[PDB]
């Protein structure tokens, strides 16, 4: 019967729940007691970018760590310049509802997300001075939540019908379809070697896929509510999720289990974005209690909160040289802290 | 002004770009957005067959119809077979919510289960929408359509198989009015929003006049907060 095969699954679930306990001889907070604290980290609003007229929904830095795309729900997708506050391009979107954006590693393309589940790819360094659509990647059935770029020809889009997909761009088709979730996928992020990628779903589950083959290598269920944001430790051996449990949990990829949760008892609102700093010491996190707390990533204590936003904090990003962080809020201002 | 010859031309672009957002934010904020909720079979595609002026977009189809110099925008969220808790905050700041309930759903049972009749199904859909934390100051236009189908069904099948404690007669005027006040007793927020119901027919032309009369209310009520009277 159906229960006869599901009893094997609960036994296999009891196998892997047994193996993680056989390895956790001493947690993170007992092995790094003999470290110095990082001290208070106060960061001043160096720039502020005030072009949009709606809620900023996502952002992404270019890998030259100067340009910066930001996408709001008034149907605009503005490519800022972070050193001097300039708008390089203002790309008018076809569908005004945009739930994510992502900039190219080469600096050539930019792809809006969408609530109309079509991940349209824009071309920047083009002839004729425009920014026209390169290709619209229809084929999901839900909505779209986070779509990072592998390179200029492969884009990994999470969706809202529990299917993370990998597209080609010279042709419009998919190549794989990473299925295996139950609640809809809310965010993803690629490893620094772009061979693996994690994806935080809505059933308190985060799965480490692989890009080539297309199967889930490991799953990580540690939360209670949905996982709302995800990011990598900058070597690709650990990743931290963010939830509506107000708890950034730092997992890893070679010991299968959760290393540390970053909980504070005074915070009750969710997490919307998580981004590690470079060298992986300062885990930033953006709650929707209007703050943006800055957690040490090896001891669970806090540091200087980045207050200053009059609404939610919807997107973060540390530049690839680790220089600045920029937060995009639900009032229209981005603030490039430093 | 300590800037190079090209960088002086760069901020000339970024104030010509900034001019084309502030002269476009003053075009979208003059126009009225309208979420269009309801069940997928409850006459949802009929009320966009009233006035329609504007295949890949399987998620959200817009309808940019206008009336008496007012560019409305209806957002049919029909293709979203996903969790409403994750994208409904995108629609915070909508001007009014056009909800729809087929009036013939009192006796018509749900498809997947022979229980939780579609009037009770649409009521619990309406209670989650109306009392949502993102929709407080947004009024709810509620259409009761299929009213040319309802009044000849209650003549031959009673209403009390949907509501257990009705205790009333079986005319169209007194019973459909009970369903109408059945929905308006669902808001815990009584004075921060006002449900403008309506019994629209399938053939009449009066509902687009009605939705203009209920947007002119909530635009006025959105202006009383900004001017300081309310």
């Amino acid at each position, epitope marked *: 019967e159906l229960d006869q095969l599901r009893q094997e699954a609960e036994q296999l679930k009891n196998q892997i729940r047994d193996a993680r306990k056989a390895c956790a001889d001493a947690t993170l907070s007992q092995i790094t007691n003999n470290i110095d604290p990082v001290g208070r980290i106060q960061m001043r609003t160096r720039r502020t970018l005030r072009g949009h007229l709606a809620k900023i929904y996502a952002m992404h830095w270019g890998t030259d760590s*100067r340009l910066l795309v930001s996408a709001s729900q008034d149907g605009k997708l503005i490519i800022w*310049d972070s050193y001097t506050t*300039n708008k390089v391009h203002a790309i008018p979107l076809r569908s005004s509802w945009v739930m994510t954006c992502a900039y190219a590693p080469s600096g050539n393309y930019v792809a809006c997300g969408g609530l109309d589940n079509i991940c349209s790819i824009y071309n920047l*360094k083009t*002839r*004729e*001075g425009n920014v026209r659509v390169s290709r619209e990647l229809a084929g999901h059935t839900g909505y779209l939540s986070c779509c990072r770029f592998l390179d200029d020809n492969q884009i990994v889009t999470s969706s809202g019908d529990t299917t993370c997909a990998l597209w080609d761009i010279e042709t419009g088709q998919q190549t794989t379809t990473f299925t295996g979730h139950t609640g809809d996928v809310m965010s993803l992020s690629l490893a620094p070697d772009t061979r693996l990628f994690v994806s935080g779903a809505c059933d308190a589950s985060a799965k480490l896929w692989d890009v080539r083959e297309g199967m889930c290598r490991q799953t990580f269920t540690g939360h209670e509510s949905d996982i709302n944001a995800i990011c990598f430790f900058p070597n690709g051996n650990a990743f931290a999720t963010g939830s509506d449990d107000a708890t950034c949990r730092l997992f890893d990829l070679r010991a299968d289990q959760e290393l540390m949760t970053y909980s504070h008892d005074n915070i009750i609102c969710g997490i919307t974005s998580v981004s590690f700093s470079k060298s992986g010491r300062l885990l930033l996190a953006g709650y929707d209690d209007f703050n943006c707390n800055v957690w040490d990533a090896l001891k669970a204590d806090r540091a200087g909160v980045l207050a200053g936003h009059d609404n939610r904090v919807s997107c973060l990003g540390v530049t690839d040289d680790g220089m600045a962080v920029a937060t995009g809020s639900w009032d229209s201002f981005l603030k490039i802290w430093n | 002004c300590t800037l*190079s*010859a090209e960088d002086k031309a760069a901020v000339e672009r970024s104030k010509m770009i900034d001019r084309n957002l502030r002269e476009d934010g003053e075009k979208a904020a003059r126009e009225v957005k309208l979420l269009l909720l309801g069940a997928g079979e409850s006459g949802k595609s009929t009320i966009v067959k009233q006035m329609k002026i504007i295949v890949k977009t399987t998620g959200i189809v817009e309808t940019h119809f206008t009336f008496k110099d007012l560019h409305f925008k209806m957002f049919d969220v029909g293709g979203q077979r996903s969790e409403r808790k994750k994208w409904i905050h995108c629609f915070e700041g909508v001007t009014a919510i056009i909800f729809c309930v087929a009036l013939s759903d009192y006796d018509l049972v749900l498809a997947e289960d022979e229980e939780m009749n579609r009037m009770h199904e649409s009521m619990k859909l309406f209670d989650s929408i109306c009392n949502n934390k993102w929709f407080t100051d947004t009024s709810i236009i509620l259409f009761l359509n299929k009213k040319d189908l309802f009044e000849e069904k209650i003549k031959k099948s009673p209403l009390t198989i949907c509501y257990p404690e009705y205790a009333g007669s079986n005319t169209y005027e007194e019973a459909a009015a009970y369903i109408q006040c059945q929905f308006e007793d669902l808001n815990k927020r009584k004075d921060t929003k006002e449900i403008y119901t309506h019994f629209t027919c399938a053939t009449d032309t009066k509902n687009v006049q009605f939705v203009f009369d209920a947007v002119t209310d909530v635009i006025i009520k959105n202006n009383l907060k900004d001017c300081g009277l309310f």
Partner: single-chain antibody
Amino acid sequence: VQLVESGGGLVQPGGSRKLSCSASGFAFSSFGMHWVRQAPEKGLEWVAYISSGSGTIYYADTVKGRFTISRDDPKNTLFLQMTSLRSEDTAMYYCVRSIYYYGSSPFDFWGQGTTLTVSSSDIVMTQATSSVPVTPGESVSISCRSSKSLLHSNGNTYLYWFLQRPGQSPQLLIYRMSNLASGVPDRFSGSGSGTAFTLTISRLEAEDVGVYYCMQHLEYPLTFGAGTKLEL
């Protein structure tokens, strides 16, 4: 994409002639147009400029006040009206385009060029070479020394190199410094020093013949150099 232009012919001095540049193929309203002339024995000199949306208009010193410029965005045409020309304005006039943001490539596409024939504080750029002979295969370098320090205070050394194959219209080679334009091979590579510059060709073939104008862009008026000819 092209910028065909018309006008000119033969004009009596002191008169006037309206020069039109009908730019068809792109989005015109985002392109700050210039106007560069070429005397029939001399190099290139800058003449005019109008920014995007007709906001900022500069001029050269020689043509200040007597040359007026205008843009027509819906008619998609660019107008240069010349009042009371002298005999020192007989030249081929080029209608070039340029868009200015971070990481752009100004002066990228140059028009075909019309002829205008008459009847009878700024930074200088020298080019110490003139008319070098070169066989295909030898790595040749072209020097171009400035006078002011072209390195600004944000890392940029605004020195746009160029090329002009004989007969035809010029084209970009190297924008700001050691950046390649869209569609040039990897043989051309520049290396700067703030005042002294060098355009290195690693390997070269028979299509790379012509003159090589180095042009600054640090402040208006932007002066080309007297370019070095390449022969066989």
